[PDB]
Amino acid sequence: LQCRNLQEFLGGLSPGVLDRLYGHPATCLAVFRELPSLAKNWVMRMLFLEQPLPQAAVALWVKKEFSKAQEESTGLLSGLRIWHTQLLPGGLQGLILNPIFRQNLRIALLGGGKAWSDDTSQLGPDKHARDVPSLDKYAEERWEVVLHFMVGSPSAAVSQDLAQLLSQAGLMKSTEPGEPPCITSAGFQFLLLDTPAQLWYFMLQYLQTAQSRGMDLVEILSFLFQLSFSTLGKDYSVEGMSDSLLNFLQHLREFGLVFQRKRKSRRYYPTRLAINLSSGVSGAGGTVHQPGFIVVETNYRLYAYTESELQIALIALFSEMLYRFPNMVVAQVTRESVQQAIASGITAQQIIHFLRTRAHPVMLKQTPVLPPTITDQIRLWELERDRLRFTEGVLYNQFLSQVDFELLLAHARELGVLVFENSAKRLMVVTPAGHSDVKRFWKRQKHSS
Amino acid sequence: GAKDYRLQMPLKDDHTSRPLWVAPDGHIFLEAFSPVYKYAQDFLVAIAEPVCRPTHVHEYKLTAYSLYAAVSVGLQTSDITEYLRKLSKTGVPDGIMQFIKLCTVSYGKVKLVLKHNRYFVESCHPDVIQHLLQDPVIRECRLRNSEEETQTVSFEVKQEMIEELQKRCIHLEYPLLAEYDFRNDSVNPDINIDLKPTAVLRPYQEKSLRKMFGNGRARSGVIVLPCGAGKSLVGVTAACTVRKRCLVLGNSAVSVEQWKAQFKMWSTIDDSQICRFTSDAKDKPIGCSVAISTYSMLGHTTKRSWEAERVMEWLKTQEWGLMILDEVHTIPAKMFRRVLTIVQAHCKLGLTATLVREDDKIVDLNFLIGPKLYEANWMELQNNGYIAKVQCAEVWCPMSPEFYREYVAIKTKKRILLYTMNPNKFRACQFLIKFHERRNDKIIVFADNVFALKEYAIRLNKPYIYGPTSQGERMQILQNFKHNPKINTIFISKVGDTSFDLPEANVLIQISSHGGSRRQEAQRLGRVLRAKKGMVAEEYNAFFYSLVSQDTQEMAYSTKRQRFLVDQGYSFKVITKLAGMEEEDLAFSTKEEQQQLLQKVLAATD
Amino acid sequence: LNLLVIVVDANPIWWGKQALKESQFTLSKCIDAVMVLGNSHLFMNRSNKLAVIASHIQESRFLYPGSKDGKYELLTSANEVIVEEIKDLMTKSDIKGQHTETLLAGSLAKALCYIHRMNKEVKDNQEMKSRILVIKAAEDSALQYMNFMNVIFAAQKQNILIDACVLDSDSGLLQQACDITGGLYLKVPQMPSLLQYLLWVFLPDQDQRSQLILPPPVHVDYRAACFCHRNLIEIGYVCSVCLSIFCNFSPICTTCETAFKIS
Ligand SMILES: [Zn+2]
């Protein structure tokens, strides 16, 4: 999963759409934190000055050694529309902070006209208030329910609304009468992926289908920034949220990012998953959500000290399990079991990462246990798949002079129907579907003679 | 593929003080990190035989024969079950407990006592002896017309039928118990044999001998011990402990000399009287009493009379000591029964490192030689520094394309010869020789084919020893390599025997894995590679290289070797590329030279 | 995780003269600039922490110890507590003939121990950089020099950088403190524009300061005057017993009252 980091989605947006996102004060604070220190300090410097500042002055402030680093940050600011060029009468061109972005940062920094994103009329004690540890358990259970659809367990209690999102996401595909759920190869890789990265990918999929729903993309993004900074101890009010946000909150309950005591309740409790959600892997060798429970051995014996149906299913896909016990689960990384994971569709690096992420503390700091000897064998199996390539290829004959064949090769290469140049053998690798266009070019070559 | 024993064993929250998991199948898992593991491991060795010994977790499976050995020790049935409960994370299954009860119900279902060199069978209960007599085969082989005996019934048993009786006892589920009484053998004369106080004794060897003696009279047992690493010392020390004339059988002629050499330093009795049946020395055989023989190989029928008849007769009368067996896996099946017929021993001792003998699941001679009393830990030996921590690297070389086309075309043994003679594999061996030459460490190369090593040696101008060579010429080259301090590459065949020297050398290269004797190759790795210095440091001067031809299915043996390696504790790695074999000047680098090699193998008759 | 501690030397007599002058810059404006700088420091990094201390003539008071306007709740609360503390201290003052000048050294000593207790509270695994910003409008005191020197040594031992900006006149004690610590020393020509100077040099983190170009700290001269006749000497004899500078060699040393041994 590419890490947006509040940059990739912002990049390529229309300037007015970026200004609409900058309309919320909370989003501007999140963007300010996202900005690198050199850019962030400069935005603070230009925050108090209305006058545009010339490029020559901008070059002067940074040292010549650090000027190259500043140019990359300046490019990010221009793409985000935080900095917009202003043409001065003099040759030097002034750079001025975006007014909507500047005003909202000023509203967060000092008193402003806006009343803030969240307002509470007067709520203190909450009936059936959710405990912080119970919130953490609820968040883990709800995410397991989303995953468990890709297991077929009775614990998969999706609200059907989540199931429709899963089909739109493509992690789970329903085919045949009765729409029975099936796991896509991408879905198996998604299960292997860490939970914070999984949440971020799901949010991007929600944004893609948000346009069909009609929910505003900027409003959903603003709520996501609030979720990242949300504190379990703090409580937030459902009232003061738009109807699209209320629908998003109901979907958030299915994700487990947000816990609602009641759908119509005017108070909602932030959940651990929302704070955990981020565009990054939780750890290379550690998981914030779960302490490592998998023991990794060069012998290929794996012991799991935590008993969960979802965890057992994930371990089973990469490695078949010889024995099952509640205290410890015995699993072997057989060559056949890894081959079954490849047939389902999985990343070999992801399997190593999954074992390292849940590796036991005794296993950590030991060089041999982290990489199994089977990984060399997995590369050899991948090489066998790489060796054999299948595509349909039409065949052309009587090419005669090589120069005429080369002219056809250039047309075929542009089409992409050509698999190989094959200049000497003079046998076309053009696909049958694209053969008609290549044949038309070949006939034109015959006419030119 | 998943077995749930959660129903079989009740779950109890006692995992901190317990390192063992007990299951109905009898498979048990031991945590090496836990402190309680050392006590658990000793209990596991006595009641169970390990299918595998991974360093991180020890795997032990309960065996009826191993349990019977514990019953022979005299451990109480309640105590064995109680020890399992003490070390069990989850409650012990009732069915496994019932299996333990049946094995420990009687210490010996049938008890065998040697009196006046006669195998009398004595039973506390007359009905049990009557049940043994019921079998028709036992009646046919029963000896007829040949003391505080309260509640004792004794019937004489033919020495020849004793081996048959053991097989019949397994059929009747009435296993024999080996008991020897020195007072009962009045005819045998007591003699004094003492190990030299100056001579050092390894601790593991002393512990194994102490266990074999057990309580009172010595009890027959088989001890797994390193071969070529103090292996001779354990047997000679055992002979001193018995204080009775004893015979050592070694298939290798060189091994017999090594056993004698160890015996000579500690005992000054040998200087006054020395007799060797091997080599037909026959020096004062009656007076010396102790003799050295090679199973039934030494005996010749119709080739010689007078002296040969006397040599066979003298061994039985002069030596009444427990039989000593070496390289049992190398020995063919039923050879031990033939030796038992020629000379009868009250107890049987086996000293071979390999867990499995003869590499046959269907046929095992373990029942004939008795249960395995103790197994040496190879990892412990590496910590001691008696044996080097061998590093095993597998080098994979692609089969030559011209060679492969011939290999698929013919299913004859010539195709196996083509796989053994792989030019890329030869280049990898030559590069390894160059790498060892830079180190200056002594290097040995072994090829499964007898002439394959010789052909490579002729190309590299290196000395070669093969099975069809004069023993004296082969020994002289071995003396130059070890006794003389010189560094050279020597190509060695199996030669039909195992050769080891007092000077210790390390490093071996395996050209091919197609050899029929898989256990012999596994033994060769331990015997050839030895610690450069006593108490060797963690850094190892011992490097083992295996050359594998790709697409010849040589990997299948390599997978079997890994199971042997985990028990050894030897470090294991695989290198697909030597990362410099191609960037070196080696013979057969050119494809045309490889084609010439292919033509020569095809020209040679299958 | 960067700790910025701001210490301002406030003299009611000096600030009162500024109020009598009726200049646009005021004591109220100076505190407002400090609060805006503090809000910016907290805004750039949530981990970064701000502590504000004001020095009265005879005492030192620590000013630092919702979103009504949409301003961040933490920033609004921090400013409110400081506003109550500053007004209470400034409105009531006690006139002392002996001490008409506020003690910067006493405030600095309190700040250094406060940083030390906070550093102990901070987890060892997380790393905190501690820096001190000093704004001085009061005149330097010769008597306070002995106390001032010890606080500079405490900052050097604790490796806390001291950065000082002087609104009207450079202070020899203050410039020496910056030189020993290695912290940047700056003089602000325009008192109303002080906030802009604070943002450019004082606000950036030490890593950010190296990347940007900032005016170099003024070189500090070293002056040795004998306390005997309060007179500066290029070469001064120093007595071994009392370590006191002497303009000329003395057979009997007055500072320790011992007589120098003569061979
Ligand atoms: Zn003095």
From Swiss-Prot, chain A:
Subcellular location: Nucleus
Cellular component terms (Gene Ontology): core TFIIH complex portion of holo TFIIH complex; nuclear speck; nucleoplasm; nucleus; transcription factor TFIID complex; transcription factor TFIIH core complex; transcription factor TFIIH holo complex
Residue ranges of coiled coil: none
Keyword Transmembrane helix: no
Family annotation (InterPro entries): Tfb2_C (IPR040662), TFIIH_p52/Tfb2 (IPR004598)
Biological-process GO terms, alphabetical: DNA repair; nucleotide-excision repair; transcription by RNA polymerase II
Source species, domain of life: Eukaryota
MF annotations from Gene Ontology: ATPase activator activity; double-stranded DNA binding; RNA polymerase II general transcription initiation factor activity
UniProt keyword annotations, A-Z: DNA damage, DNA repair, Nucleus, Transcription, Transcription regulation
PANTHER family attached to this UniProt entry: GENERAL TRANSCRIPTION FACTOR IIH SUBUNIT 4 (PTHR13152:SF0), TFIIH, POLYPEPTIDE 4 (PTHR13152)
Subunit text: Component of the 7-subunit TFIIH core complex composed of XPB/ERCC3, XPD/ERCC2, GTF2H1, GTF2H2, GTF2H3, GTF2H4 and GTF2H5, which is active in NER. The core complex associates with the 3-subunit CDK-activating kinase (CAK) module composed of CCNH/cyclin H, CDK7 and MNAT1 to form the 10-subunit holoenzyme (holo-TFIIH) active in transcription.
Function per UniProt: Component of the general transcription and DNA repair factor IIH (TFIIH) core complex, which is involved in general and transcription-coupled nucleotide excision repair (NER) of damaged DNA and, when complexed to CAK, in RNA transcription by RNA polymerase II. In NER, TFIIH acts by opening DNA around the lesion to allow the excision of the damaged oligonucleotide and its replacement by a new DNA fragment. In transcription, TFIIH has an essential role in transcription initiation.
Family the UniProt entry places it in: Belongs to the TFB2 family.
Domain commentary: The C-terminus (residues 305-462) stimulates the ATPase activity of XPB/ERCC3.
This protein's name: General transcription factor IIH subunit 4
Gene: GTF2H4
Swiss-Prot record, chain B:
Catalytic activities: Couples ATP hydrolysis with the unwinding of duplex DNA by translocating in the 3'-5' direction; ATP + H2O = ADP + phosphate + H(+)
Localization per Swiss-Prot or TrEMBL: Nucleus
Residue positions of motif DEVH box: 326-329
GO BP term, example: transcription elongation by RNA polymerase II
SUPFAM superfamilies linked to this entry: P-loop containing nucleoside triphosphate hydrolases
Residue span(s) of domain Helicase ATP-binding: 212-373
PTMs per UniProt: Dephosphorylation reactivates the 5'-excision step. Phosphorylation has no effect on transcription or the 3'-5' helicase activity.
CDD domains attached to this UniProt entry: DEXHc_XPB, SF2_C_XPB
Keywords in alphabetical order: ATP-binding, Cockayne syndrome, Deafness, Disease variant, DNA damage, DNA repair, DNA-binding, Dwarfism, Helicase, Host-virus interaction, Hydrolase, Ichthyosis, Isomerase, Nucleotide-binding, Nucleus, Phosphoprotein, Transcription, Transcription regulation, Xeroderma pigmentosum
Regulation of protein activity: ATPase activity is stimulated by TFIIH subunit p52 (GTF2H4). DNA translocase activity by this subunit in TFIIH is stimulated by XPA, ERCC5/XPG and XFP plus ERCC1; translocase activity is sensitive to triptolide which targets this enzyme.
Function per UniProt: ATP-dependent 3'-5' DNA helicase/translocase. Binds dsDNA rather than ssDNA, unzipping it in a translocase rather than classical helicase activity. Component of the general transcription and DNA repair factor IIH (TFIIH) core complex. When complexed to CDK-activating kinase (CAK), involved in RNA transcription by RNA polymerase II. The ATPase activity of XPB/ERCC3, but not its helicase activity, is required for DNA opening; it may wrap around the damaged DNA wedging it open, causing localized melting that allows XPD/ERCC2 helicase to anchor.
The protein's name in its UniProt record: General transcription and DNA repair factor IIH helicase/translocase subunit XPB
Organism the protein comes from: Homo sapiens (Human)
Gene name per UniProt: ERCC3
UniProtKB/Swiss-Prot annotation, chain C:
Family: Belongs to the TFB4 family.
Organism: Homo sapiens
Keyword flag Cell membrane: no
Residue spans, zinc finger C4-type: 239-256
Superkingdom, natural source: Eukaryota
Keywords: DNA damage, DNA repair, Metal-binding, Nucleus, Transcription, Transcription regulation, Zinc, Zinc-finger
InterPro entries reported for this sequence: TFIIH_Tfb4/GTF2H3, vWFA_dom_sf
Role played: Component of the general transcription and DNA repair factor IIH (TFIIH) core complex, which is involved in general and transcription-coupled nucleotide excision repair (NER) of damaged DNA and, when complexed to CAK, in RNA transcription by RNA polymerase II. In NER, TFIIH acts by opening DNA around the lesion to allow the excision of the damaged oligonucleotide and its replacement by a new DNA fragment. In transcription, TFIIH has an essential role in transcription initiation.
GO CC field: core TFIIH complex portion of holo TFIIH complex; nucleoplasm; nucleus; transcription factor TFIID complex; transcription factor TFIIH core complex; transcription factor TFIIH holo complex; transcription preinitiation complex
Subunit structure: Part of a TFIID-containing RNA polymerase II pre-initiation complex that is composed of TBP and at least GTF2A1, GTF2A2, GTF2E1, GTF2E2, GTF2F1, GTF2H2, GTF2H3, GTF2H4, GTF2H5, GTF2B, TCEA1, ERCC2, ERCC3, TAF1, TAF2, TAF3, TAF4, TAF5, TAF6, TAF7, TAF8, TAF9, TAF10, TAF11, TAF12 and TAF13. Component of the 7-subunit TFIIH core complex composed of XPB/ERCC3, XPD/ERCC2, GTF2H1, GTF2H2, GTF2H3, GTF2H4 and GTF2H5, which is active in NER.
Location(s) in or outside the cell: Nucleus
This protein's name: General transcription factor IIH subunit 3
GO biological process, one term: transcription by RNA polymerase II
Gene Ontology molecular function terms on file: RNA polymerase II general transcription initiation factor activity; zinc ion binding
Pfam families according to UniProt: Tfb4
